[PDB]
Structure formats: C-alpha cells, structure tokens
Design a protein around this nucleic acid. Structure first.
Ligand code: MN
Ligand code: MN
Length: 183
DNA sequence: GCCTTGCCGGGTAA
DNA sequence: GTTCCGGCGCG
DNA sequence: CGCGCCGGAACTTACCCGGCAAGGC
C-alpha cells in the first residue's frame, strides 16, 4: 500500500525530528498536534508537505498544513485529533510493521536522525528501546550493526551500521524506489 | 599502513 | 523539539 | 460551557558533525 508506506516514512520524521502533542489550554480548551521540524524551509514545503497533504487527503482529514517560522527552524504542523491518533496508534503497534513499513520507517528516521554525510552510517536517539527494534529489523535485512552510549553527557545512544554492509544498507533502505525517496 | 568504529566535545537544529 | 500564549467555531 | 482547529514564538537540549586514536587485518 502506498498509504502505509508514506505513513511509515512520515512517522520516522515525526519521531525523529518532531512529535505528537496532546495539549490542554485554559479554559477546558484542547489541541492535538502532529509536528515535523527542520532548518530548511524548502525541504518542508517541497519534500515533506506534499507527502503529508496526500495522507491528509486519503484519510479525509479536514485540517490544514501549517508551516510556521520559528527562531531556529521551520515547523510543519497539522492540528487534528484524527491525525494525532492515526500516528499515535501506528507507533503503539510498531513491532508489527511489515517489510514495506520497516523500510520506510527506517528511511524517515535516518533522514531525521542519521549521519547525512554517509561517510559513516549512524542513528542517534535517547530511546534505546526504539533503536533495538531498528537493530533487529536491520539484522533481518542482512545489515550488521551495533548500539552504544555515544553521548554520556545527555544519555544519547547511537546505532552504528557496519561499513561492511554500506552498500547493502544504502541501496536497500535509503535508495528504495518502493517508498518516498529521501533528500 | 589503511580502515573500521568506540568514545568524545561543540553548538545548533531540533 | 515542547509547551506556553491569545484567537476562532461549533453543538 | 466544553472542546478542538488556527497562528505565533519563547524556551532548553538532544541530536548530528567531525576529530582522535585503539584495534583489526
Ligand atoms: Mn529526535
Ligand atoms: Mn534532523
């Protein structure tokens, strides 16, 4: 499914570079936000927004894509209870992703939290449990890898992909024509 | 000698 | 990345 | 009166980048 592939790719960006927020305001007001942040205004308008719009359209979600200018980065934001629970639930059953979803989700996550030079192959995150899930998926794909505590200051773990499988990983996960192609 | 990777600090893009 | 602010609509 | 969609933007750090050097072959 095109929809499931795209969803999974977005979830990787969201988990990596944004978030899912259930906000409570005065007085009894609420808001449900789906967010991806990024330094480049173009990357958001030209690569991400179209992907999100499409999804919003397939799900018949009524909200709009807001792009907000912040002091340090741009924010792509969708305010929508439906979309919020769409992704929140998708995340809960992450261990049940098929292979299309695993591949897409890793692509998005790498685009968000990865070594973009590609000189090394690395994914940082404080959530070890999440990295271990990606570790198992990668192993099943024949991409060897390890997980260590990289940043002792803040508790950040890195998942190191072995250069031995550089080609396997790059051609298989990053350059996959089956899902949204990375930047 | 050349690569791979564990560990690290800088500071900004989250 | 996360969570405040002050708006608005709608049953 | 109770909630959920817009539009901003202040407020801290968790990411990414790139060096070093120990260890493998
Ligand atoms: Mn992150
Ligand atoms: Mn990023």
């Amino acid at each position: 499914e095109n929809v499931s592939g795209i969803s999974a790719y977005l979830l990787g960006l969201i988990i990596g570079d944004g978030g899912l927020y259930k906000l409570k305001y005065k007085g009894n007001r609420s808001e449900y936000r789906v967010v991806i942040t990024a330094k480049s205004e173009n990357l958001i308008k030209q690569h991400i927004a179209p992907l999100m719009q499409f999804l919003i359209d397939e799900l018949n979600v009524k909200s709009k894509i807001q792009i907000v200018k912040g002091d340090t980065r741009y924010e792509l934001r969708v305010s929508s209870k439906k979309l919020y629970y769409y992704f929140a639930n998708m995340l809960e059953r992450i261990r049940l992703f098929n292979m299309r979803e695993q591949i897409a989700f890793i692509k998005g996550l790498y685009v968000a939290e990865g070594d973009m030079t590609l000189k090394r192959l690395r994914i940082w995150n404080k959530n070890k449990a999440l990295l271990e899930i990606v570790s198992r998926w990668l192993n099943n794909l024949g991409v060897r890898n390890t997980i260590h505590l990289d940043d002792h200051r803040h508790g950040v773990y890195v998942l190191n992909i072995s250069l031995r499988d550089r080609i396997k990983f790059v051609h298989t996960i990053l350059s996959s024509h089956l899902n949204p192609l990375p930047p």
